[PDB]
Amino acid sequence: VIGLILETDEILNKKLRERKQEELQLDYNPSTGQSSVLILDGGMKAKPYSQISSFKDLDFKEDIEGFNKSICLAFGVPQVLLDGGNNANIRPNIELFYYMT
Amino acid sequence: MQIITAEDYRLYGGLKRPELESGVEVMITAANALITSLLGMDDADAVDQLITTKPTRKKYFLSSPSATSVTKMTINDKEIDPEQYKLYSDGVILLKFNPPEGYMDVEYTQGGFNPMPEDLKLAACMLVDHWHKQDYRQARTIGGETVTFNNTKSGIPEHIRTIIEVYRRV
Amino acid sequence: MQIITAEDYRLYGGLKRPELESGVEVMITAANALITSLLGMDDADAVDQLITTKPTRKKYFLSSPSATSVTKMTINDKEIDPEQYKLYSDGVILLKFNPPEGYMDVEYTQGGFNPMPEDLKLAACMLVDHWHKQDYRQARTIGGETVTFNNTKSGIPEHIRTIIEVYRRV
Amino acid sequence: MQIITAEDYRLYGGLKRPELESGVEVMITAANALITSLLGMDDADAVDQLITTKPTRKKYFLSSPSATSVTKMTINDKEIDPEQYKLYSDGVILLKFNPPEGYMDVEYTQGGFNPMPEDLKLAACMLVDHWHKQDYRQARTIGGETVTFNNTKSGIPEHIRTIIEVYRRV
Amino acid sequence: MQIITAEDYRLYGGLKRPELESGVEVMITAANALITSLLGMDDADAVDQLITTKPTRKKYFLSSPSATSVTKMTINDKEIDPEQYKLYSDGVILLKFNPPEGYMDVEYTQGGFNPMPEDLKLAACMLVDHWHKQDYRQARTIGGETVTFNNTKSGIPEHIRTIIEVYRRV
Amino acid sequence: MQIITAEDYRLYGGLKRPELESGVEVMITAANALITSLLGMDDADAVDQLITTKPTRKKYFLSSPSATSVTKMTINDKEIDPEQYKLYSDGVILLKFNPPEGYMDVEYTQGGFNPMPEDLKLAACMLVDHWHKQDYRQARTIGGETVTFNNTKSGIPEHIRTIIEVYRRV
Amino acid sequence: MQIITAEDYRLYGGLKRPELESGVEVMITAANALITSLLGMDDADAVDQLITTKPTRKKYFLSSPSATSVTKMTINDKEIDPEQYKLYSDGVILLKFNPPEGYMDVEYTQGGFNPMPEDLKLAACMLVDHWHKQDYRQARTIGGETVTFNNTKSGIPEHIRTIIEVYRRV
Amino acid sequence: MQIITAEDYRLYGGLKRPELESGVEVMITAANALITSLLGMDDADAVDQLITTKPTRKKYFLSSPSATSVTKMTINDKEIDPEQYKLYSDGVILLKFNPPEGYMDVEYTQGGFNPMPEDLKLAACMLVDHWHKQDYRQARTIGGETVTFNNTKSGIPEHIRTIIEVYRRV
Amino acid sequence: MQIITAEDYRLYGGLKRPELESGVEVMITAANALITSLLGMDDADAVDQLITTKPTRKKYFLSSPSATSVTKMTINDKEIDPEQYKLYSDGVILLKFNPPEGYMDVEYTQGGFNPMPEDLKLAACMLVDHWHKQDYRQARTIGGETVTFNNTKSGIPEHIRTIIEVYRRV
Amino acid sequence: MQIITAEDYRLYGGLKRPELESGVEVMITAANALITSLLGMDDADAVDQLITTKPTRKKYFLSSPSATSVTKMTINDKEIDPEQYKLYSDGVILLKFNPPEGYMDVEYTQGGFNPMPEDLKLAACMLVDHWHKQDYRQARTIGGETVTFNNTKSGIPEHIRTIIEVYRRV
Amino acid sequence: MQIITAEDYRLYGGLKRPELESGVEVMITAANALITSLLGMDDADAVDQLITTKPTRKKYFLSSPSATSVTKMTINDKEIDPEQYKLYSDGVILLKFNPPEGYMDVEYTQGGFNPMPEDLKLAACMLVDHWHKQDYRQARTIGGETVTFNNTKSGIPEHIRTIIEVYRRV
Amino acid sequence: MQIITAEDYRLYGGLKRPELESGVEVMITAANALITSLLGMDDADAVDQLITTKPTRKKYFLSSPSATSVTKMTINDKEIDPEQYKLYSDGVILLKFNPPEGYMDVEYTQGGFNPMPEDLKLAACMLVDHWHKQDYRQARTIGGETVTFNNTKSGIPEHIRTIIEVYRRV
């Protein structure tokens, strides 16, 4: 995860660059900071980056639910037995489980 | 600070006249002031600064990364003994305890470049040479032998610019 | 302010004539005024300020960061004793209490560059030299020796620009 | 206003003829009028101004920030006592009360540059020098000594532009 | 209007011939009419205007900001006495009452630049000099002393353009 | 129209020959025609117009804003008395009543530039001069003294363009 | 049409030879045909047209706006007496009734430029001068006196283009 | 078609030799064929065409807009008498009845430019002049009298291009 | 095909030597081959074609639009009598019946330019001239007389390009 | 560091004078310091570093990749024996255990280029040659033999830039 | 490594002096070091590497693809016999078993270009020649014979760049 | 590989000296190595390759498309007889059976350009001519006869580039 990507066409003293990096990270976090404005001097630019592979792409939940239903399918247990059911689910589904499986 | 002075400017060149020219005497001091103001330094024995403080933040950064020691520390008008905070190599100061929310007042002593780096000496010498012979133009022709000058970033030429940017955070 | 005067101009150059030229005499004080109005300064013994104030704001910024002290304080036409507010190194004034919502009236005394930096001295000398001989053209030649002049940011050339910008917030 | 006149033009240059040239005599007042209408000033003893009023707004801005004091205030055709409002350093006027919705009729006395800044003095002198010498072309050559002229912003030259912009809101 | 005439042209330059040249006589009045038509003027003793009117709008703007007074007002064919309206410094006319929806008919007298600004005099003189000398090309050379001419906005050069549009709304 | 004729062309220049040249005599009247068809005029004593009409529209715009009066008015082949409509300063005709939906037939007499503006006279003289000697090329030289010509907007050069455009809606 | 002929070409120039050159004789009529087909005309006594008919459309547009009158109208193979329609100044024809959906067959008589405008006369004279001389290259020189020719839009030159476009809809 | 031939080429210029050069004889007919193929024409007495047909389409467009008459008509192999269709001025043919869906076969006779326009005559003369001497480069120089050549659209120069595309749909 | 040969090349020029040069003899036939393979032809008495066929498609397009007739027809290995299909002016073949889905095998005889167009003759002559003397460089000079050559589209220059493109699909 | 010295600079050239010039003597150490601060090193016997620590991190990276060994490691003010952490070839240090959340204090000894690299030697010799000879302008002309200089990235020249960037991470 | 030495430099050229020049002697080894650190090589008998390991990964890539063999293997501080892992032609090591999650410690011996490619020899000779002759400028002239040097990618010129990049991953 | 050697380089030129120059001896073999490394070739009698294998993939591609035969095949450490796989014309090897998932080990013999193509011979001759003659600048002149050099893709010029990428995948 990245908050900012600042690049400069000139070399700016890795030790002090890293100190400023830490200061600027801690200063601009509302939990631990009291600043929200950047005045970049000397020609330093801020690259308008974007997240490459977001977590929203990995929509595994439907696949995981399918694998769970398939796993419960082989043994025979109805899916309502594992979850909660109404008056119209619990005893009919328990009867199916016992009898049929 | 005091980076060059007449002796080092003379050593940079091969000047034979015992007395420096009229234009260079003020030019040296202007170069020293401009270098120390570009880098962010301010020549001062001690500095007072109001750092905002929030809980769950146990490191606060001083303005000058060349801070020697903290004379006294204050959070909402109550001094804290030097045992609770420790100042590290850079301007970072770390607090052993968890500071209460409010405002922080620290008075530290600034010590900057006691061994003076030679890069800054060369950069200031190049600025004063850049100003003495009036070479801030895009190009200049003298009869047949002409010169076109280097690109300028933020006014100052490229070489002085790169030296400054190497040292432009103290 | 008063940055250069004839003594500093003559030290900058090697002028031999006792009396300065007709054009330079007014041009120096005009360059002084342009520099002092360009950095944000306004030469004045005291300044009156309308600071809007909101609760849960304990620090307010004065217009001139070169404020040595504040004379009297007023919120909604009532004076506050000096013990309840403290003016820090910059133009910041810190308020111990929570201000009631309204308007502020603060009168402070401006102290600007009592030790005058030589950066502004060189900048003003270079600007008045820039105006004396007409060095405000893209290029100029007399015969064969051509000169192409420097890029201009906001009118003023690169060198004056960098000096001013390094000192353009006081 | 009246910034330069023949005496200040002659002091700017080194003119030896007791009588000014025919062109410069009207050109001086032309430059004067152009600058005094270019900065936003309007040479007038008093000004009438229609400020709209909305409740919960206790500060109103006069057109000219160089207002010394306001003679009388009229909201919806009724005068207001001077104790109910106060005029600060800039053109702002602060009302103690909440003005009812409607229109204001304020008559204030303009005081503009009682001490004449020398910045505008060079601005006008350089304008009249710009016009007397036909310095409003991209380049001009006479034989071999060619000159390329400065970039022009909004018609006016670059240096005059930066001076004007430094004083372009009075 | 009448801005320049032969006397102002002659005092603008140093013309020695008692009689003006044939080409300048018509060119002067051409410049006078072009200036008055650029700014939006209409040289006329009185002007009739159809102002659309809507309720809850108690300020209407006349065509010419140099309106002296309203001779008579007609809204939907019924004259309104002078007491119900008041014409302000600019072309704004303010109505005390609430106008009914319909059409307005105002006959006002225009007074424009009775004290003639010297800016427009200089601008018209510069246009007529721009036309007599046929300096409306991109560049022009006579042997070796070449000239490269200034950029044109809407045909007219930069200097005349800036003067005009400083005064191009009255 | 008839803007220039031989007398005004000769007054524009300093021509010494009594009889005009063969080419200029046709070029003058052709320039007159081009200008009068370029501004939008069409030289005609009276004009018939098909204005579409809709209810809740009490004002209609005539083709020529230089219409001094309207002769007869027709909506759906029925005449309306002059007392029921009024023609204002521009080509606007105001309807007292609400016109029924249909088509309109108005015959009006155009009065165009009875006092002939001198801007059009100078523009047409400059255009016929532009055509007489071939001044419609990007650049031209004869030996050593070269000229680069002005930018052309919509064919006609910048100066003629600005004059026409300032008068291009009559 | 027939706009120029040898007499108008000779009056345009100052040709002394009683007989025109071989090249110009066909070039005149070539330019004539190019313009008369360039503006949109087709030189013909009468024109037949298919105008599509949709109900609720009481105005139809003829091909040539220079139509004098329409001899006969045919909608879906049935003639309509002239009392049911009227042709206005332009090519528009207005129908009193609602046309049934179908096709039209209108025969109108074209009258184009009975007074020949001098604008098109200069257009054709300048075209034939453009082709005789060989003025259709980007640049040309003979020794030292070079000429760079005007920008060409749609092949035809700039001035000819603006004249044509002024009349390119009849 | 046959546009120029030797007589028209000779009267275009002033050629004195009784016999045309070897290179021009082939080049004339080459230009003649190239133009008639450029415009879309094809020299042919009769043309067969498959027009697609759909119901509710009562107008079909022929390939050549210079169609004189339809010799015979065929839709799905059955001839239709000349009474049901009528060919109008352009290539448009209109059907009185409603054609059934299928395929359409028409044999018409083309009559193209029987009065030969002088525009194509001049265009082909300039084309063959363009090819004869090597005037189809970007520029060409012979000693000092250099020439920079005209811009080319689709190979053919600007002037021939504009004539062709004024007539480029027959 | 065979477009030029020595006779037509010699008639294009004015060559005096009886025997052609060594380079031109092969270059002519190579130019012929490049033209005949550049336009899309392939010199062959007969051509076999695999046309994919779908139902509800009654017209199929042959490869060469210069197909004078079709010899035999095959759909899914069965011959169809010539009474059931007929080949039109272009390469289109129209089918009376609805073809069963499958593949088609048609052998047709190509007749291409039996009357040889002179456009291709001129294009091939210009191309072989283009190759003979090295006229495929951006510019070339011999001493002082330089030539800048024309732009090249797809290798071949503009003139050859336009001729080929006009005939690029037969 | 001390990479070059007079002996290696002399060996780079062929300087016959036993005693070095005044300018190069300080220039050597200036280049040395600029490169040793440009590659990222801080010339120091030992370094203290505040490394933040998180659980599930077993490998931590020291500031300088040229770390030889860690004298002592301190997590939240308690040292840890050398047997439980290990430092690999680069600056990375591997922890056998899972470190509790807090901060680390590591004191390591830097060893930088014990075998002197000839790349940096050549780069520094090229820097001092670049500064001694006035070689930091875009181009320079001496009579007839002129030189335009290399492109500069971040002020420093191109070749020195590539050498540094090859070693700009130690 | 050791690529060139004086013998291969002298064989590359035709140098006649027995002793090599002072400048070349250091530049040779400088070029050697730059090439061997530019390709990614690092001259070392053995290398230790921290390879992160995850289960279901049976192939790990060593740092240097020129790894002759691996001496000892360590995963979480336990040695694995060589029978269980095999190192292939490149730096790839294939593991028969599934590694437990943790860290890897491998010590391998690198053999780099034992038969030394002549590509690197030519590249290093050309680079050291590029340096001896101060050929790192954009262009250079001595009198009349000028040379413009080729583009530089990442400092090193095109030819050296292509040779390196072809061998820049060992 | 071995493409040129001294005999083929001499046959490329017309060199008369019995012994080749000192600079060409290394340069020839450098060109040979560079080309054989550009195309992807690696001079080796046999090569071991790790091909990943997945089920339902019955064709795998060898690293070198010039593979002669497979000496042995190994999937998960078990040799497969030569009957189950067949190597085709390119590097493709097809498997009759369905390979189980795992890793594949094949050792094949590379045979590359046993008849050496003349294209690569010419390309290497042009590279060695490119390097002997320092033909690797943007432009170069000796006196007046200048040369501007060809564009370079990835360092190597256009002609060598096109030959290489004609053969750049073996």
The string of DSSP letters for B105-161 reads EEEEEE---SS--HHHHHHHHHHHHHHHTT--SSEEEETTEEEEPPPEETTEEHHHH
Helix (H, G, I), strand (E, B) or coil at K75: strand
Q: Which residue, E6, E16, E14, E1, is CA-closest to E128?
A: E6
Cβ neighbors of E151 (< 8 A, separation 6 or more) are: D138, D152, E157, E158
CA distance C89 to chain B (A): 7
Contact G12 F23 (CB under 8 A): yes
Rounded to whole angstroms, the Cα distance separating J102 from E90 reads 71
Please name the residue of chain A whose CA is at the shortest distance from the CA of residue B91.
Answer: A19
Tell me the CA distances in angstroms from C136 to B137, C141, D126, H120, one per residue in order.
Answer: 12, 13, 11, 60
d(CA E58, CA H74) in angstroms, rounded, equals 77
How far apart CA L82 and CA L69 sit, in angstroms, is 10
Cα gap I130→I134, rounded to integer Å: 7
Record: contact H149-G137, CB cut-off 8 A = yes
Pairing type for strands L102-110 and L67-75 reads: antiparallel
CA D125 to chain centre: 15
D29, D154 Cβ separation under 8 angstroms: no
Tokens 């750049």, residue? L168
H51 phi-psi bin (left φ>0, alpha ψ -120 to 50, beta other): beta
> Could you give the CA distance from residue F152 to residue F155 in angstroms, rounded to a whole number?
5
Q: J38 contacts in B (CB within 8 Å)? A: 166
Instruction: Kindly provide the residue ranges of all beta strands, DSSP E only, lying in E16-165, ordered along the sequence.
Output: 46-53, 59-61, 67-75, 85-87, 92-95, 102-110, 139-142, 145-148, 152-153, 156-157
Lay out the sheet containing K46-53: strands in order across: K46-53, K102-110, K67-75
Q: Find the residue in C nearest to B105 (Cα).
A: C88
Q: What is the CA radius of gyration of chain L?
A: 22
- The DSSP result for H99-157, as a single string, is PPSEEEEEEEEE---SS--HHHHHHHHHHHHHHHTT--SSEEEETTEEEEPPPEETTEE
Residue whose C-alpha is closest to residue G52's, from C58, H94, A41, E24? H94
Instruction: Report CA-CA distances (Å) from I128 to B155, I4, I26, I35.
Output: 61, 10, 10, 11
Most G-contacting residue of H86, H87, H150 (CB-CB within 10 A), to test interface: H150
What is the widest separation between alpha-carbon atoms in chain F?
72
The three state secondary structure string of chain J is CCCCHHHHHHHHCCCCCCCCCHHHHHHHHHHHHHHHHHCCCCCCCEEEEEEEECCCCCEEECCCCCEEEEEEEEECCCECCHHHEEECCCCEEEECCCCCCEEEEEEEEECCCCCCCHHHHHHHHHHHHHHHCCCCCCEEEECCEEEECCCCECCECHHHHHHHHHCCCC
**Which of J118, J121, J159 lies at the smallest CB-CB distance from K136?**
J159
Contacts of L4 (CB under 8 A, 6+ apart): L12, L28, L31, L32, L121, L124, L125, L128
Pairing assessment for the beta strands C145-148 and C139-142 based on DSSP bridges: antiparallel
**Yes or no, beta carbons of L30 and K161 under 8 Å apart:** no
K19-33 in b/e form (b: 16+ CB < 10 A) is eeeebbebbbbbbbb
Rounded CA-CA distance J38/A24 in Å is: 22
Alpha carbon distance D48, D109 (integer Å): 10
On chain H, the residues whose CB falls within 8 A of the CB of I144 are: 141, 143-144
Beta bridge partners of H152: H157
D151 vs B72: CA distance, rounded Å: 55
Please name which of G115, G94, G89, G147 lies closest in space to residue G3, comparing C-alpha atoms: G115
Nearest to F162 among E22, E30, E155 (CB): E155
CA of A14 to nearest chain J CA: how many angstroms apart? 6
G148 in Cβ contact with F139 (< 8 Å): yes
Q: CA-CA distance, F79 to F107, in Å (whole number)? A: 12
Which residues are CB-neighbours of I133 under 8 A, at least 6 positions away? none
Using CB atoms, list chains with 3+ pairs below 8 Å to chain K. Answer: J, L
Beta bridge partners of G142: G145
User: Residue B31: which of J134, I9, C126, E109 has the closest Cα?
Assistant: C126
Find the CB nearest I162 among H23, H143, H155. Answer: H155
Half-sphere exposure of G142 (CA within 13 A, CB side): 1
Measured distance CA(H102)–CA(K117) in Å, rounded = 76
Considering only CB atoms, G155 lies closest to which of H14, H121, H162, namely H162
Report how far residue F7's alpha carbon sits from residue F25's, in angstroms, rounded to the nearest whole number: 11
With vertex at residue H36, the alpha carbon angle to CA H30 and CA H41, rounded to the nearest 5 degrees, is 150
What is the C-alpha separation between F10 and F25, in angstroms, rounded? 11
Contacts of J133 (CB under 8 A, 6+ apart): none
Contact H118 G144 (CB under 8 A): no
In this complex, the chains that touch G, judged by 3 or more CB pairs closer than 8 A, are F, H
Q: Among I62, I50, I115, I52, which residue's Cα sits nearest to residue I87?
A: I62
Contacts of G145 in chain F (CB under 8 A): 140-143
Q: Locate I130 and state its tokens.
A: 């283009």
CA-to-CA distance for I38 and I165, rounded, in angstroms? 9
Q: Does A43 sit within 8 Å of B154, measured CB to CB?
A: yes
Distances (CA, A) of K84 to F151, K96, L52: 83, 6, 19
I113/I39 Cα distance (integer angstroms) = 12
Q: Is D154 left (phi over 0), alpha (psi -120 to 50) or beta?
A: left
Interface of J with A in 62-81 (CB under 8 A): 63
Q: Are J94 and J87 in contact (CB under 8 A)?
A: yes
Q: Name the β-bridge partners of D148.
A: C139, D139
Cross-chain residue pair H147–G131, CB shorter than 8 Å: no
Rg (CA), chain B: 22
Closest Cα partner for G25 from H166, H31, H13?
H13
Beta bridge pairs of residue B110:
B67
Q: Do B169 and A20 touch (CB under 8 A)?
A: yes
Query: In this complex, do L26 and K8 lie within 8 Å of one another by their Cβ atoms?
Result: yes
How far does L3 lie from chain K, in Å, by closest CA?
Answer: 14
Spatial distance between the Cα atoms of H167 and G74, rounded to a whole number of angstroms = 30
**End-to-end Cα, chain L, rounded Å:** 12
Burial of L90 (0-12, 13-18, 19+ CB in 10 A): exposed
Query: Is residue E26 within 8 Å of F4, Cβ to Cβ?
Result: no
Number of H helices, E strands in chain I: 4, 10
Tokens of B28: 């040296």
Question: J42 — contact with chain A (CB < 8 Å)?
Answer: yes
Both structure tokens of I58: 């009654």
Which residue of E23, E50, E152 is in closest CB contact with F12?
E23
Touching chains, C (3+ CB pairs < 8 A): B, D
Tell me which DSSP letter residue K46 carries.
E
Task: Pull the structure tokens for residue J56.
Answer: 């599930």
- Rounded distance between C-alpha atoms, residue C5 and residue C116, angstroms: 13
SS3 call for L5 = helix
Closest chain A residue to B103 measured between Cα atoms?
A34
The Cα–Cα gap between H50 and I94 comes to 10
Q: According to the 3-state scheme, what is the secondary structure of E124-164?
A: HHHHHHHHHCCCCCCEEEECCEEEECCCEECCEEHHHHHHH
Interface of J with B in 120-149 (CB under 8 A): 131, 136-144
Q: Residue E85 and residue E108: Cα distance in Å, rounded?
A: 13
Q: How many CA atoms lie within 13 A of E41 on its CB side?
A: 25
Instruction: Give the span between the Cα atoms of A83 and A98, in whole angstroms.
Output: 17
- For residues I146 and H141, the answer to whether their CB atoms sit within 8 Å is yes
Q: Cβ distance B157 to B130 under 8 Å? A: yes
**CB within 8 Å of J48: residues ≥ 6 apart:** B88, B89, J105, J106, J107
Cβ atoms within 10 A of the Cβ of I5, count? Answer: 11
Nearest by Cα to E28 from E168, E127, E148, E144: E127
Question: Which H/E stretch holds residue L118?
Answer: helix L118-132
Element housing H160 (H / E): helix H158-166
Q: CA–CA separation, F143 vs C165, rounded Å?
A: 52
Q: Alpha-carbon dihedral of residues E135, E141, E142, E144, nearest 10 degrees?
A: 140
Angle at J41 between CA J39 and CA J45, to 5 degrees: 160
Surface of J (11-70) touching B: CB under 8 A: 21-23, 25-27, 29-30, 32-34, 37-38, 47-50
Dist CA D101 CA J160 (whole Å): 72
Residues in contact with A45: Cβ distance below 8 Å, sequence separation at least 6, in sequence order:
A6, A7, A8
Residues D166, C37: contact at Cβ < 8 Å? yes
For G100, residues 6+ apart whose C-beta sits below 8 A from its C-beta are G53, G55, G75, G76
The one-letter amino acid at J59: K
Phi, psi (degrees; rounded to nearest 5) at H74 = -145, 125
Distance CA H97, CA H107 (A): 19
Q: Which residues of chain B lie closer than 8 angstroms to A17, CB-CB?
A: 169
Strand partners for K109: K46, K69
Report phi then psi at J98, rounded to 5.
-95, 120
Indicate the residue of C32, C141, C155 with minimum beta-carbon distance to D145: C141
**Sheet order of strands, J102-110 included:** J46-53, J102-110, J67-75
C-beta atoms of K166 and L47 within 8 A: no
Q: Which of helix, strand or coil describes residue I71?
A: strand
The residue among B67, B113, B75 whose CA lies nearest residue B93 is: B67
Mind spelling out the 3-state secondary structure of C99-159? CCCEEEEEEEEECCCCCCCHHHHHHHHHHHHHHHCCCCCCEEEECCEEEECCCEECCEEHH
Residues J33, J3: contact at Cβ < 8 Å? Answer: no
> For residue B51, which of B40, B34, B63 has the smallest C-alpha distance?
B63
H33 neighbourhood in chain I, CB within 8 Å: 117-119
Interface contact flag, L138 K146, Cβ < 8 Å: no
- Rounded to the nearest 5 percent, the helix, strand and coil shares of chain C are 30, 30, 40
Q: Which residues of H touch G35 (CB under 8 A)?
A: none
Token digits of residue B127:
């600025």
Task: State how far the Cα of F49 lies from the Cα of F108, in Å rounded to an integer.
Answer: 9
Q: Using an 8 Å Cβ cutoff, are J50 and A15 in contact?
A: no
Strands, E, within D20-169: which ranges? 46-53, 59-61, 67-72, 85-87, 92-95, 102-110, 139-142, 145-148
The DSSP code for L136 is -
Cβ atoms within 10 A of the Cβ of E99, count? 21
Please answer whether residues C95 and C60 qualify as being in contact, where contact means their C-beta atoms are separated by less than 8 angstroms. yes
Rounded distance between C-alpha atoms, residue B87 and residue F141, angstroms? 78
Q: From CA F23, how far away is CA G125, in angstroms rounded?
A: 11
Nearest to A42 among B54, B90, B154 (CB): B154
Does the distance separating the beta carbons of F13 and E26 come in below 8 Å? Answer: no
DSSP assigned state of K42: -
For residue H124, give the nearest of H43, H7, H27 by alpha carbon.
Answer: H27
Supply the DSSP string of chain F, one letter for each residue: ----HHHHHHHHS---SSSPPHHHHHHHHHHHHHHHHHSS----SEEEEEEEE-TT--EEE-S-TTEEEEEEEEESS-B--GGGEEE-SSSEEEESS-PPSEEEEEEEEE---SS--HHHHHHHHHHHHHHHTT--SSEEEETTEEEEPPPEETTEEHHHHHHHHHTTT-
Q: Do H89 and G154 touch (CB under 8 A)?
A: no
Coil, strand or helix at K2: coil
**Sign of CA pseudo-dihedral H29, H31, H32, H36:** positive
Instruction: Determine, for residues C150 and B152 on separate chains, whether the beta-carbon distance falls below 8 Å.
Output: yes
Cα L142 to chain centroid, rounded: 37
**Residues forming a β-bridge with K157:** K152
Please give the order of strands across the beta sheet that includes I67-75: I46-53, I102-110, I67-75
Burial class (CB in 10 A: 0-12, 13-18, 19+), G165: middle
Partner residues linked to I148 by β-bridges = H139, I139
| Cα–Cα dist D110/D95, whole Å | 20
Stretch (H or E) spanning G87: strand G85-87
Run of H or E including K48: strand K46-53
Closest CA to B39 of J131, J39, A16: A16
Place of tokens 């100190």: A19
The total of other beta-carbon atoms located within 10 Å of residue J155's CB is 24
